[PDB]
Amino acid sequence: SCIQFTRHASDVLLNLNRLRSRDILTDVVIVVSREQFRAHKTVLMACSGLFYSIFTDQLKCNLSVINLDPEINPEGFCILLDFMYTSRLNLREGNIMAVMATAMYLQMEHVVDTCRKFIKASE
Amino acid sequence: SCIQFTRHASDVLLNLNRLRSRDILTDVVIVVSREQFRAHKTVLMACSGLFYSIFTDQLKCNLSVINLDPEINPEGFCILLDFMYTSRLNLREGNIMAVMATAMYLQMEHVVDTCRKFIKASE
Amino acid sequence: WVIP
Amino acid sequence: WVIP
Numbered sequence: 293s294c295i296q297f298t299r300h301a302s303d304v305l306l307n308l309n310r311l312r313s314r315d316i317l318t319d320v321v322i323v324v325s326r327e328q329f330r331a332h333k334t335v336l337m338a339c340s341g342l343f344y345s346i347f348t349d350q351l352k353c354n355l356s357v358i359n360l361d362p363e364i365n366p367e368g369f370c371i372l373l374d375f376m377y378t379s380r381l382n383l384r385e386g387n388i389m390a391v392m393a394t395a396m397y398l399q400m401e402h403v404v405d406t407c408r409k410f411i412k413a414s415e
Numbered sequence: 416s417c418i419q420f421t422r423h424a425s426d427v428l429l430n431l432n433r434l435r436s437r438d439i440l441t442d443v444v445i446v447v448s449r450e451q452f453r454a455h456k457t458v459l460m461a462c463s464g465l466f467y468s469i470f471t472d473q474l475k476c477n478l479s480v481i482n483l484d485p486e487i488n489p490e491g492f493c494i495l496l497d498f499m500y501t502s503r504l505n506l507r508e509g510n511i512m513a514v515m516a517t518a519m520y521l522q523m524e525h526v527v528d529t530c531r532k533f534i535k536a537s538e
Numbered sequence: 539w540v541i542p
Numbered sequence: 543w544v545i546p
């Protein structure tokens with residue numbers, strides 16, 4: 293018999309992104325080659341099969357620094373991290389291959405799906 | 416020029432609620448009289464003007480336990496905490512006064528609004 | 539607010 | 543996916 297506030301989930305995510313911009317309560321640094329990205333472990337797990345696996349691990353859950361595979365592109369990661377916190381994906385011709393490879397590694401199935409459909413349309 | 420995934424914010428919130436149920440990465444206990452509620456500080460700040468004020472405070476941000484005013488009803492808090500994590504509000508005739516008073520204290524303006532409209536319709 |  |  294509950295009632296539901298339509299915009300609640302979007303409002304929560306907007307405030308989680310504000311916390312990220314101000315660096316409030318971030319508890320992990322993701323290292324992608326020469327670049328560093330601060331984030332909230334809970335948001336990363338909620339968006340990614342890879343981070344969900346990492347942060348449920350009894351040892352890795354307590355790490356303050358996570359290093360990704362050297363093949364991962366920092367811009368691709370940045371675009372996906374922005375997507376996690378906003379629902380918006382900056383998908384461009386110049387970055388689509390890097391975004392798709394990063395989404396496959398991060399296990400972000402909906403992003404992989406769309407990257408596949410956008411590449412198929414161009415061939 | 417971004418594209419947007421409509422269900423992303425709802426999917427994030429569903430996974431944050433799964434983390435709460437499994438007690439994963441919860442970093443605070445909210446004490447309401449004889450009852451205790453574990454939660455994520457980031458979600459509490461994102462939903463409530465009161466918790467946003469508390470957890471941006473340079474001293475209170477590091478507390479593992481927060482005690483609410485003894486006038487706050489545990490069921491009212493429980494209903495609002497469930498709302499924070501799901502967008503669903505279990506608003507009933509028997510609990511509406513407690514929910515509205517708790518929402519005013521927690522500074523959850525949209526919940527206060529609706530409680531006001533539901534009471535006005537019954538008078 | 540809506541009836542879900 | 544949509545054009546926001």
Ligand SMILES: N#Cc1cnn2c(Nc3ccc4c(c3)CC(=O)N4)cc(Cl)nc12
Pocket residue numbers: 337338339340341342344399400401402430431433434435437439
């Ligand atoms: N507790 C918890 C919890 C926190 N996060 N999380 C999940 N996170 C996830 C796992 C896999 C994938 C994605 C997100 C996006 C995608 O494409 N795959 C799943 C579950 Cl079943 N549970 C949880």
Ligand SMILES: N#Cc1cnn2c(Nc3ccc4c(c3)CC(=O)N4)cc(Cl)nc12
Pocket residue numbers: 307308310311312314316460461462463464465467522523524525
């Ligand atoms: N950074 C950050 C950040 C984290 N949380 N948060 C806000 N949380 C909030 C503040 C007031 C109210 C509500 C939520 C619901 C309501 O009725 N009032 C606001 C801002 Cl402006 N910023 C942030």
Ligand SMILES: [Cl-]
Pocket residue numbers: 339400401402403404
């Ligand atoms: Cl995804």
Ligand SMILES: [Cl-]
Pocket residue numbers: 462523524525526527
């Ligand atoms: Cl609200």
